[PDB]
Amino acid sequence: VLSPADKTNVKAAWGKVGAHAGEYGAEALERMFLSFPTTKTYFPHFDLSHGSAQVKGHGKKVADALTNAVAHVDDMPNALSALSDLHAHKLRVDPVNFKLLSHCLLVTLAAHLPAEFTPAVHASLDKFLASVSTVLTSKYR
Amino acid sequence: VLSPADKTNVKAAWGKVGAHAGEYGAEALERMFLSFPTTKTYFPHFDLSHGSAQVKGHGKKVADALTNAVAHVDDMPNALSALSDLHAHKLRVDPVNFKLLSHCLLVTLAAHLPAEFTPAVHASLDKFLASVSTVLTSKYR
Amino acid sequence: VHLTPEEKSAVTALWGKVNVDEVGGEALGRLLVVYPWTQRFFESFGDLSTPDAVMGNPKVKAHGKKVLGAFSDGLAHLDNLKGTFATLSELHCDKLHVDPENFRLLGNVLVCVLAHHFGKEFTPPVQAAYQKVVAGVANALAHKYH
Amino acid sequence: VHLTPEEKSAVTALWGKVNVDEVGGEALGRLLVVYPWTQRFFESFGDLSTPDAVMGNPKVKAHGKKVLGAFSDGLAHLDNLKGTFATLSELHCDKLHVDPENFRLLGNVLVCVLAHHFGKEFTPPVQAAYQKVVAGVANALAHKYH
């Protein structure tokens, strides 16, 4: 339901992330696992050590889904529809954990994109990630 | 957008509430103000005394918006759209307070619907109130 | 947490009425139905396939008696909730990896169960006294998380 | 709160590099921009209608310095946050009626501001240490609400 303003800021920030999107996805996951260790139990078949190849590969899938969501910003429910079923029905991800990963994504963007991470862009990225989270939790309505 | 099961469960429950919806909205407000006193500061020059005619008036407004949303479950963003600009911009209602009111609405419905408030109907009413709360906070998303 | 004399009396009288063999299972069953991500932690309890299966599940009934027993212990120790949940806090944090937001949800489900079973007797003041109790329990169980 | 000694060391070292005149202002202004319901508590601070207006607002900057000073007090008293924040807990609860969920939000905004200020230096381990600190400050400010 993002305002016009919010879509402009999100595309600009994500544009500059560019080919680093996978790296930043992987760093956001690492920050989440270290800051909020309850979240590690969703990844029992993963090497969660610093610089894990498996976490790098999973970061790419998360980043790709966000890239796709930015490209489909006006129709996010449909662009992430299968992911809601996976996260809610199969994986039973606690809704709190989406707030945790979203926060860790904002921290990662602030650490790498000091020029781009203005207060306006921060507010827009938070609204973009909450909207992504609302879709991924939507089989919890 | 509630599931078919949730829409059917909410309509059944709301039908049993029937003409008592305003009564239950007042009781839910009363319950919120007593259980969660931080919420009283959003009604600074209201009479918040037990059985307040003013709280009855407001309980009617809340109950009527919920009854309208039950009749418009497949288009709630449109049916509540007015209230969302209000609660975000003018009132600056903390998103947590929607969770507090929603809980007090469930307690009120439980205390009045001995037969109807089954675990599945409770789950559907929770999804319904969460969906209402999401529309009413959408100017933050 | 500190209840007024009025509030302690109200809490104790209602809790006397509570069926210790059933109310905990009712609260845990409703948690699992209402907030279905919570089933992730209870899959070894067996059949959770429908709301009736969850509510009739023998492991859910059995474990609910222990959850309610932990609440009854807390009601007897409002003054010292941290000690009354000390190792239970460690169990939920270190072994089970439960997010402490769910302790607030279970407290709120228990309040809804008391409202459902006791009807008009679960007055706004009685509810306000129970909201202090279940917040106090949730904060005590969250102690080891911070 | 339970920082390991290494986490306390990591937190203290970074905090020494924090500009006391600016970071509290940045964190408060971003709270007001990102979570606009929070503007309800600062309705006398003047124009908060645009990001640029908030971030350049002198009362926001002045108040932010006092907020950062209180975090500095928390970092110098990590084994007694409850006592350190007892007065401020009563103030926020009795006179301001601020929901304690907003204490968690301001702590997370401060973490974003430290990341913005320190770049790669704000490593995942340093962030994990700071999450324990801001969770403990929020917990301590919430104490009198219980």
Ligand code: HEM
């Ligand atoms: C911005 C939020 C999120 C996005 C965009 C996202 C995206 C994805 C994607 C694209 C997949 C892979 C689907 C496939 O390849 O078929 C996935 C899998 C998964 N996600 Fe998420 N996710 C998010 C949040 C979360 C959170 C918060 C958790 C848990 C704390 C989580 C846990 C998982 C798990 C466990 C998998 C399966 C991993 C495996 O075994 O391969 N996700 N997610």
Ligand code: HEM
């Ligand atoms: C189910 C949730 C809610 C519903 C359905 C709802 C509905 C309404 C309605 C219909 C009105 C009146 C609109 C008009 O006057 O034309 C209103 C006003 C208001 N609402 Fe909400 N509301 C909800 C939640 C909340 C919450 C959680 C708060 C605060 C804790 C809140 C605070 C107010 C206030 C302060 C007013 C204005 C009363 C006055 O000063 O005249 N609302 N709401």
Ligand code: HEM
């Ligand atoms: C907030 C109040 C809660 C209380 C008082 C409580 C109490 C207990 C107690 C006493 C046990 C030990 C059972 C035994 O070994 O006999 C336990 C175990 C457990 N609790 Fe909780 N708990 C609470 C909340 C939660 C929540 C919200 C979850 C998950 C969403 C959870 C998940 C578990 C699990 C998975 C076990 C292990 C059960 C097993 O496999 O045997 N608890 N809890």
Ligand code: HEM
């Ligand atoms: C979590 C960390 C927080 C800390 C450490 C903190 C600290 C403080 C301090 C030190 C003061 C006194 C200022 C003075 O000496 O003049 C204060 C006042 C105040 N705080 Fe907080 N605060 C926090 C969170 C919040 C939040 C989240 C809100 C609102 C959303 C808030 C709203 C206020 C207000 C309105 C005042 C009175 C300001 C005035 O009008 O002068 N605080 N706080």
Ligand SMILES: *[C@@H]1CC(=O)N(CCC(=O)NC)C1=O
């Ligand atoms: C500080 C602010 C506030 O609400 N309270 C009451 C705490 C409480 O609910 N105790 C039962 C304060 O003392």
Ligand SMILES: *[C@H]1CC(=O)N(CCC(=O)NC)C1=O
């Ligand atoms: C997180 C969960 C937990 O049990 N604790 C306390 C002690 C512990 O084992 N930490 C390593 C937490 O801090």
